[PDB]
């Protein structure tokens, strides 16, 4: 089913990156001066997407790691689409903890669509194995990579963190990635 | 490429009517009670959703047809989604209008994933051609039709409108299917 995640990938792009990525710099511009916390640093640039292997995507992010902080929201995005008025697209910003400090503060989420991936495998309708299921979460990775690589969207304001569990902590995988700006 | 639409309408009710259509119905009676204007008739129940088999989806349904008016928006649905705290769904109400009068009101909406369809069959790298595109829309709209045959959640809450253009009335085709209830 090489083309499930094909077009996953692609409506992952069309309907939610290549109209969030545009703004996203100007929305985090303007947190970082008119709601942070005056004492803390900066959030930092680009959205860091999530991308288990696995497609376990609690809705939580602390579930998935206790170091991992909800902190706030960014500004809303809004717009009329397909028929919705003023159609709400909003993103959490996470505090990173290592040894119980503050070592990141950033935009942070899972790729949804790994979502219908996990839930295609487990309706007997969609004709979908639990086998297929990391055989089309790689190629929704690396079709997405290839996408974002020519995309004019995105300028350094996206960052794809995939990864797998075989202890792992997100926390640390998120932070080597921050740290590596 | 079977699997693209397969994995589009799979996606749509998973990430999304899975997750409205069992609150719907209580959006709409709270508007009704608490919202609509007190000397015009309910909102119908039901999302009215809308799939143009040419995939011509506007974001502006006055566009389409100036007999359809945007009214009012219902409640707000939220909840933590992949890590986004309190994603919001919302929905638009829309009044139909025959020989200059509302002829009905209801919530309506274009089915977004066929926004997908469009702008793969525009993009090179896609690899996805125009002819595809047809057929991946039906696709589409049978898959989706088979899967609400079966869902728990679809209890007359849902009914999905296909058409084609070759004059059409958007509007008459939406109320031909608000009359029928
Ligand atoms: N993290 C995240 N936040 C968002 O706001 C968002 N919006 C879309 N997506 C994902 O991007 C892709 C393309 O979006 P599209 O609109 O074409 O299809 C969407 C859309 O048709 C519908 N849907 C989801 N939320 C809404 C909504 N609030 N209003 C209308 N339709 C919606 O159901 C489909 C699947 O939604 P998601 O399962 O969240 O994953 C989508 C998809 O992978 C999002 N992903």
Redesign the interface.
């Known amino acids: 089913?090489?083309?499930?995640?094909?077009?996953?990938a692609?409506?992952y792009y069309?309907?939610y990156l290549r109209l969030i990525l545009p703004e996203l710099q100007a929305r985090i511009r303007t947190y970082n001066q008119h709601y942070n916390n005056l004492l803390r640093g900066a959030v930092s640039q680009r959205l860091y997407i999530?991308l288990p292997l696995d497609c376990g995507?609690?809705?939580?992010?602390s579930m998935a790691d206790p170091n991992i902080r909800?902190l706030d929201?960014l500004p809303?995005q809004t717009?009329?689409?397909?028929?919705?008025?003023?159609?709400?697209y909003?993103?959490?910003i996470?505090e990173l903890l290592e040894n119980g400090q503050r070592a990141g503060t950033c935009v942070?989420?899972?790729?949804?669509?790994l979502?219908?991936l996990f839930?295609?495998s487990q309706?007997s309708?969609?004709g979908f194995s639990r086998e297929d299921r990391l055989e089309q979460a790689k190629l929704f990775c690396r079709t997405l990579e290839?996408?974002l690589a020519?995309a004019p969207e995105s300028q350094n304001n996206c960052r794809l963190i995939a990864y797998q569990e075989p202890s792992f902590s997100l926390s640390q995988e998120v932070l080597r990635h921050l740290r590596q700006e």
Do not use: C
């Open positions: 089913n090489f083309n499930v995640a094909h077009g996953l692609w409506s069309i309907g999530l995507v609690p809705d939580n992010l909800f929201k809303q717009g009329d689409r397909a028929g919705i008025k003023d159609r709400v909003s993103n959490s996470y942070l989420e899972y790729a949804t669509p979502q219908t839930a295609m309706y309708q969609a290839d996408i020519d």
